[PDB]
Write a protein that binds this ligand. Structure first.
Ligand SMILES: [Br-]
Ligand SMILES: [Cl-]
Ligand SMILES: [Cl-]
Length: 117
């Protein structure tokens, strides 16, 4: 989401006060606060956000780059940037951290695909 109207009942990933580090999403306010306090590492928060933001059927046919053996859709890039910003504001992730978090997201998408077979 670039705007509040995209998800009127949702939340901002990142910080609403920063136009360059915010992405509107479908997660409701109380659920976002639950994720904040229950997901105690950046990796756990990333993977939990992924399950709130992308249906498992979408995860099964997607990955970050949109590449695979018979094609994969890219996970929505603006939403992924929103995850990055959200993790930065909560945990202070570095570039190295983010690369690894991306590896964990891609592994989760591969697991979603395997579970369907
Ligand atoms: Br990004
Ligand atoms: Cl809150
Ligand atoms: Cl778990």
């Amino acid at each position: 989401g670039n705007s509040e109207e995209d998800y009127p009942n949702g939340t901002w990933l990142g910080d609403e006060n920063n136009p360059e580090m915010r992405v509107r999403c479908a997660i409701i306010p109380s659920d976002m606060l639950h994720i904040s306090t229950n997901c105690r590492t950046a990796e756990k928060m990333a993977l939990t956000l992924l399950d709130y933001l992308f249906h498992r059927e979408v995860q099964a046919v997607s990955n970050l780059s949109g590449q695979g053996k018979h094609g994969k859709k890219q996970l929505d890039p603006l939403t992924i940037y929103g995850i990055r910003c959200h993790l930065f504001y909560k945990f202070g992730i570095t570039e190295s951290d983010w690369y690894r978090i991306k590896q964990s997201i891609d592994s989760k998408c591969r697991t979603a695909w395997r579970r369907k077979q």
